[PDB]
RNA sequence: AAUCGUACCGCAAACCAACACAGGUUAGUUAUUGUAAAGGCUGUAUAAAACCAGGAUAAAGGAACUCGGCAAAAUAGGUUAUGUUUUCG
């Protein structure tokens, strides 16, 4: 079993292609796995939930064998410590998220610019052939 | 200031105070489902559901 | 590539204060020929702007950033473009040009002016002399001259020691706290990738 | 005042900074390095290029029991480094003496070699030399309230927030207070020094060999056992022939060995060695020089020290006696002899508390190299060895390995029966049969041995035992049969 | 909230930088199998008695951390 | 290793107020020097009445207003030699 799924249908996590199950809208950590529309029930399932946005650098972490060295004695502050654990846990989901969205928003304005570049560059050259025309024809 | 929100739903009062199980604890709850029975009411207890 | 205005007399700036076109005709004509002829204006000029508009600023700003970091005291702004255009060439056309670019530079602190002293507020404003400016080597965060900021980092650093020792005397943290949020994805990687490949090539 | 779009620089400062003391992984190193190295001042790049060392290693544990390290990560390691090290030679001119050794130290622990900054650091050295070495000489102060127009270029005050520094009394009455710092970047530029930059780094350190040597007086702090052991081989490697610097240099560890046995007291415990004890503090860090109590903080989540060490230990004493093998024509006899007696009562008294007994814990990698110096110095004793063998665990050693440690207790005259016991059972354990006998692999060696090569190993292991004189046992009986 | 009124608790990835070795040492010249046994066999076989060891010996200690100066 | 929750709304046109109600509703997180990344949202067709509401500017005078400086306006901030009163802070 590998530890993190990797064929993801792009289209469908960007959010421009509807999903396996279109009534879920939002989908939790867990549900991602089956609203992919590249579901196959070939291939074998991870041994860790995931979502998309994760880096393939998550592959090595160890959050429960590090939690128990750090558990209190105490009952009372343990069940408050195991608390805060889990929210550490799933805030680090959307975090992933976050940067996903704003890493791809710079990338798109880049590539949006340059395409503006060019588009003015060809209307300038075509312009330039024109008045090179006119004075020539005048002789 | 604003009256009218004298109802704050919270499931667990409200089994714990009119429940199935709370009326069958007293005499008098007894005899409030007796009155029900006898009026034919559909249903007994807002604890009540198939 | 500076172009000429239709005076061939300095180059266009790329700047929303420049009122003079560029000559863009196939042969060169006097002014006084085509202007009063009454012929389209477009056909001898480009009033327009250029599709690196706002590359070319940022190049600018770098060459005249450098060339006051070679210099060892303040200087006018009238010694910075005949300096400037006399190591690369005939690139800078006005000093108001410069004059913005300066502002750049002194609002976000790589740059300062020296601006002398009046013994009243009208003689201030009436004043004419010419301003000196100098360049930070590395960007500051205070104001002013290397004098005036280190009499600004003295000030701020008695005040952040007043202010550590009064929360910590209050129950206050000594030194504010945060999270660390993790900013590295699935897109992340791949810019990585992609840039040693840039570098790589 | 820094809002807008900055027409000369793309990244602001400030967040700069953010980014550098947030990094974890490579990975986000590399995003940060390869997209702002041009546009790092001296505080910056020197920072940045403290921290690869340790992310290199942080990565490689990383590894989970099944998994293997990524190949493409050290290719990148090297990669950054190179690049930082073109950006630290252009804004060298502009550091500080902290901040030079910070990044001296970065590359020549990654023994990465770079021409530009060996060739950078021989002119420092030859400044640096006839400054720190004199006598009137003051130690580094952090404690700076107006800069001056240089110190602005370092890029210290450059910051929205409190500027940590050291909050003791700089001593008045030290003499030489800045020699481990000169030790230091010594190293550091013939570690460095390339191809094309070693006769000018060779050149540097000879000047800074004979000013050494001629000099009357001694720093009133010894220099540390780190500082002696970096000079010392900052001269081996690049061949300096200096006798009157290098008996000199002995001297002084010599001195630093005997101050340490003179001021301990058997009944407090086993030898320790004195160490520098920093604590975070509300404008900076303090040292000490003897630990606190543990304490619970109401705001700090850790409060223990870190504790930076100043006498010598075992690891130090591998790396000093190193060098003298490589320095041995430069040192008179009576000097080195004086060392190795000194070596060996440190190790003693360091595993001894009370009247009994207590072994400090070492690891193989340590007893070789102490072991392998003393075969080059032809140095027997019995003393330095035996405490050695107790702390060495051998449960996950390789049979040849244990081969080996039976052989040289007996060249060294050991005589202690539990040593020898722990051995031979240890290698009976791992000496299989199939009608081939197999020695089995560990940590002491690579690969397993068949057929002739174990026979081999237990021919060695008994000769061993045999002149020792152990009396006959199961284990020892067992592996004479097999072989 | 955004402030906290003491350190997070270490749940994020964390960088140790204690142990860590720089020194240099020899290599890896040692002696061949033939060498060590020729010295073994050159031992005079000394008829010596063996110490006086207490009866248990405590197992191996392990060594406190060491850090850097490079602060 | 079984069993129960997992869709959708959740400062709201979906919950408490008879309503698609200018009201009420707990905790956890995020960008931003003088600003502010991500994400989210969107109004039948006109105008040169009186009058009403919420703003702006105003010559000369400056509480003459009024039960009443109601409302509005106003250098508002920091450091001071000296003096006064104290339960001495
Ligand atoms: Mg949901
Ligand atoms: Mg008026
Ligand atoms: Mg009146």
């Given at each position: 079993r590998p530890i993190m799924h990797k064929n993801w249908d792009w289209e469908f996590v960007v959010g421009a292609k509807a999903g396996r199950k279109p009534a879920i809208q939002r989908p939790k950590p867990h549900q991602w796995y089956y609203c992919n529309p590249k579901y196959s029930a070939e291939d074998p399932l991870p041994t860790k939930i995931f979502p998309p946005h994760a880096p393939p650098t998550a592959e090595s972490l160890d959050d429960w064998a590090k939690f128990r060295k750090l558990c209190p004695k105490d009952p009372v502050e343990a069940k408050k410590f195991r608390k805060h654990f889990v929210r550490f846990l799933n805030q680090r989901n959307y975090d992933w998220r976050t940067a996903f969205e704003?890493?791809?928003?710079?990338?798109?304005?880049?590539?949006?610019?340059?395409?503006?570049?060019?588009?003015?560059?060809?209307?300038?050259?075509?312009?330039?052939?024109?008045?090179?025309?006119?004075?020539?024809?005048?002789? | 200031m604003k009256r009218g929100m004298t109802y704050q739903p919270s499931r667990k009062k409200r089994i714990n105070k009119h429940g199935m199980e709370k009326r069958l604890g007293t005499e008098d709850g007894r005899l409030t489902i007796l009155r029900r029975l006898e009026k034919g009411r559909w249903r007994l207890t807002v604890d009540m559901f198939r | 590539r500076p172009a000429l205005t239709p005076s061939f007399s300095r180059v266009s700036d790329p700047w929303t204060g420049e009122k003079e076109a560029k000559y863009a005709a196939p042969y060169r004509i006097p002014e006084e020929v085509w202007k009063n002829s009454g012929a389209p204006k477009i056909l001898f000029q480009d009033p327009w702007n250029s599709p690196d508009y706002d590359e070319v600023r940022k190049k600018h700003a770098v060459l005249v950033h450098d060339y006051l970091k070679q210099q060892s005291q303040p200087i006018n702004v009238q010694t910075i473009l005949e300096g400037v255009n006399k190591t690369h060439g005939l690139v800078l056309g006005t000093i108001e040009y410069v004059t913005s670019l300066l502002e750049n530079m002194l609002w976000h602190d790589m740059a300062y002016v020296v601006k002398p002293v009046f013994s009243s507020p009208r003689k201030a404003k009436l004043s004419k002399i010419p301003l000196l400016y100098g360049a930070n080597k590395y960007q500051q965060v205070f104001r002013g001259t290397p004098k005036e900021v280190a009499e600004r980092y003295e000030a701020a650093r008695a005040k952040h020691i007043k202010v550590a020792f009064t929360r910590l005397r209050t129950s206050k943290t000594p030194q504010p706290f945060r999270r660390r949020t993790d900013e590295y994805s699935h897109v992340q990687a791949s810019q990585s990738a992609l840039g040693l490949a840039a570098a790589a090539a | 005042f820094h809002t807008g779009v900055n027409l000369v620089q793309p990244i602001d400062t400030s967040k700069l900074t953010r980014q550098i003391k947030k990094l974890t992984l490579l990975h986000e190193a590399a995003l940060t390095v390869l997209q702002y190295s041009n546009y790092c001042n001296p505080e910056q790049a020197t920072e940045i290029l403290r921290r690869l060392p340790f992310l290199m290693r942080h990565e490689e544990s990383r590894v989970l029991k099944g998994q293997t390290l990524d190949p493409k990560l050290p290719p990148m390691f090297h990669g950054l480094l190179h690049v930082m090290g073109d950006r630290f030679v252009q804004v060298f001119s502009d550091?500080?003496?902290?901040?030079?050794?910070?990044?001296?130290?970065?590359?020549?622990?990654?023994?990465?070699?770079?021409?530009?900054?060996?060739?950078?650091?021989?002119?420092k050295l030859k400044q640096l030399t006839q400054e720190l070495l004199d006598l009137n000489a003051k130690p580094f102060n952090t404690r700076v309230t107006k800069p001056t127009p240089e110190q602005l270029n370092s890029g210290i005050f450059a910051s929205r927030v409190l500027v940590p520094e050291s909050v003791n009394q700089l001593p008045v009455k030290a003499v030489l207070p800045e020699f481990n710092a000169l030790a230091g970047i010594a190293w550091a530029l013939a570690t460095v020094?390339?191809?094309?930059?070693?006769?000018?780094?060779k050149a540097a350190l000879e000047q800074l060999a004979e000013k050494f040597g001629a000099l009357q007086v001694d720093p009133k702090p010894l220099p540390d056992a780190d500082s002696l052991c970096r000079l010392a081989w900052a001269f081996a490697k690049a061949g300096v022939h200096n006798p009157a610097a290098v008996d000199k240099l002995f001297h002084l560890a010599e001195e630093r060995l005997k101050s340490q046995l003179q001021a301990h007291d058997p009944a407090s415990g086993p030898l320790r060695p004195r160490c520098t004890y920093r604590y975070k503090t509300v404008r900076g860090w303090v040292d000490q020089h003897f630990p606190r109590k543990p304490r619970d903080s109401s705001y700090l989540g850790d409060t223990a020290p870190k504790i930076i060490p100043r006498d010598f230990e075992i690891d130090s004493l591998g790396s000093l006696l190193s060098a003298a093998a490589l320095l041995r024509d430069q040192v008179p006899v009576e000097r080195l002899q004086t060392i190795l007696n000194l070596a060996a009562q440190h190790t003693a008294a360091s595993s001894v508390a009370g009247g009994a007994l207590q072994p400090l814990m070492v690891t193989y990698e340590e007893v070789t190299r102490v072991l392998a110096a003393c075969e080059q110095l032809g140095f027997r004793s019995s003393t330095l060895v035996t405490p050695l063998l107790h702390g060495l665990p051998m449960?996950?050693?390789?049979?040849?390995?244990?081969?080996?440690?039976?052989?040289?207790?007996?060249?060294?005259?050991?005589?202690?029966?539990?040593?020898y016991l722990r051995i031979v059972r240890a290698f009976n354990a791992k000496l299989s049969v199939s009608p081939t006998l197999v020695a089995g692999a560990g940590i002491g060696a690579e690969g397993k041995k068949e057929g002739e090569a174990a026979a081999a190993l237990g021919a060695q292991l008994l000769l061993a035992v045999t002149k020792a004189g152990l009396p006959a046992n199961a284990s020892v009986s067992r592996i004479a049969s097999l072989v | 909230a955004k402030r906290l009124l003491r350190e997070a608790p270490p749940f994020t990835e964390q960088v140790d930088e204690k142990n860590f070795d720089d020194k240099d040492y020899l290599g890896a010249g040692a002696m061949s199998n033939e060498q060590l046994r020729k010295e073994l066999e050159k031992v005079e076989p000394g008829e010596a008695k063996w110490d006086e060891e207490s009866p248990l010996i405590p197992p191996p200690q392990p060594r406190q951390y060491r850090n850097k100066g490079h602060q």
């Open positions: 704003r890493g791809l928003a710079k990338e798109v304005a880049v590539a949006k610019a340059a395409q503006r570049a060019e588009d003015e560059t060809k209307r300038q050259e075509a312009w330039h052939a024109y008045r090179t025309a006119v004075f020539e024809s005048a002789l | - | - | 550091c500080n003496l902290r901040q030079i050794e910070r990044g001296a130290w970065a590359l020549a622990a990654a023994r990465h070699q770079h021409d530009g900054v060996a060739l950078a650091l021989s002119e020094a390339g191809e094309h930059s070693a006769a000018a780094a449960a996950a050693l390789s049979a040849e390995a244990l081969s080996q440690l039976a052989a040289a207790a007996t060249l060294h005259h050991v005589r202690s029966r539990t040593v | -």
